[PDB]
């Protein structure tokens, strides 16, 4: 209740026009003040190259960057950068990989048990987006689905070192009907599509194992969203919008 409940999503802010139709971009919520490097991942299929820009302003105003080449390629757009590592779904697998950016090596590899992959339980936009990793106020999560949950979204807390599952919740929401999803304060928010008409219309509260139908609309400025994640440090939503990297601010309601 203290941490906050989503009540509103701001106008989309265009930060850059770049890259293909589909991709992801993000900052590291546990980077020290003021390490404000931008991490950038173009493409959804068999890709390995991560761009590192020095700052938000360098990201916006230049096309200069450090490149990293992942020893394994990723699927989808569901990566997350967390405490100096990139977490991602190995191409054509339900394998999750922790790639340490400080040493430029893989630190951990592990199967995400029972997770669908290879366009089995993609988000509605497709693109091998079966497994979505994200970070909120309390840590690392994986958002996916399983046969046993009938293709409905499954949410698991993930240990950032072991990559083992710490706790799992089964929701009622068919992942392939979700445009995308993100977590704020332990609540999973799911969008109705990737081109509407867009809005957050389902919330699943993990602390109470309860879901609710809600209506928090937000503007899809460039007509296709293929990535959408919350950053707890920035308190913003990062999105890839049809070859545009955009930010939304949000409002949370707090009860102390
Ligand atoms: Ca997401
Ligand atoms: Na993600």
Residue numbers in the entry: 225 to 480
From the reporting publication:
Olfactomedins comprise a large protein family (PFAM: PF02191) with seven phylogenetic branches. These multidomain proteins contain a ~30 kDa olfactomedin (OLF) domain and are predominantly expressed extracellularly in a variety of tissues of multicellular organisms, particularly in vertebrates as well as selected invertebrates. Here we present biophysical, biochemical, and structural characterization of the OLF domain of a second glio-OLF, that from M. musculus (94% identical to R. norvegicus), and H. sapiens noelin/pancortin/olfm1/hOlfA (npoh-OLF), which are both neuronal OLFs, but from different phylogenetic subfamilies. The OLF domain propeller blades are arranged radially around a central hydrophilic cavity.
For npoh-OLF, the point mutation C221G, before the start of the structural OLF domain, increased yields sufficient for crystallization (not shown). The 2.1 Å resolution structure npoh-OLF(C221G), and the 2.05 Å resolution structure of glio-OLF were solved by molecular replacement using search models derived from myoc-OLF and npoh-OLF, respectively. Npoh-OLF exhibits the expected OLF five-bladed β-propeller architecture with a short α-helix; no major conformational changes are seen between our mouse glio-OLF structure and the previously reported rat glio-OLF. Npoh-OLF has a clasp that extends longer than that of the other OLFs because it forms a crystal contact with the outermost strand of blade A from a neighboring molecule. Similarly, for npoh-OLF, Ca2+, but not Mg2+ or K+, confers thermal stability, and the Ca2+ ion is resistant to chelation by Quin-2, except under denaturing conditions. An analogous pair, Trp 349/Tyr 418, is found within npoh-OLF, and in the structure appears to be in a conformation that seals off the cavity. Myoc-OLF variants K423E and Y371D are associated with severe cases of glaucoma, and K423E is one of the least stable variants, supporting the importance of this feature in maintaining the structural integrity of the domain. In npoh-OLF the corresponding residues are Lys 399 and Tyr 347 and the interaction is part of an extended hydrogen-bonding network; the hydroxyl group of the Tyr stabilizes the carboxylate side chain of Asp 356, which helps position this residue for coordination to Ca2+ (and see above). For npoh-OLF, 18 of 20 total Arg and Lys residues are solvent exposed, with a large positive region concentrated at the top face of blades A and B and extending into two small positive patches involving Arg 400 of the short helical turn and Lys 423 of the loop between strands D-16 and D-17.
